Symmetry: C2
Subunit: 67 residues, 2 copies
């Protein structure tokens, strides 16, 4: 295949296992951190897992221009 392409792939799988793999370990430790005060004020606990949901949206929106 003649074309010359070295920056048109390996980004969707490299951006998840690349950044996610590391940003996924902090929500777990803090899962229990906020889970503790999640009783005196469950609010925080969800405020975390929620920022995580937005973390997945930002990854697909910022990856939309990395193909």
């Amino acid at each position: 295949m003649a074309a010359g392409v070295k920056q048109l792939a390996d980004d969707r799988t490299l951006l998840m296992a690349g950044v996610s793999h590391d940003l996924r370990t902090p929500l777990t430790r803090i899962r229990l951190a906020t889970e503790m005060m999640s009783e005196q004020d469950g609010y925080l606990a969800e405020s975390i897992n929620k920022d995580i949901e937005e973390c997945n949206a930002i990854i697909e929106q910022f990856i939309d221009y990395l193909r």
Copy 2:
């Protein structure tokens, strides 16, 4: 200037204001969320602002191959 370049810039300033701008709003809300249990266990509070410090390191290391 003859060369043809459309993917060799606008990435360092587009990756900070691009991703940071959004990932910086969750540490503030949680700044107070964990700040609450930061007394019954300040540990968590720092566990957050710390993941943030690593958030800046990961951005410069993942940006090192985006020039």
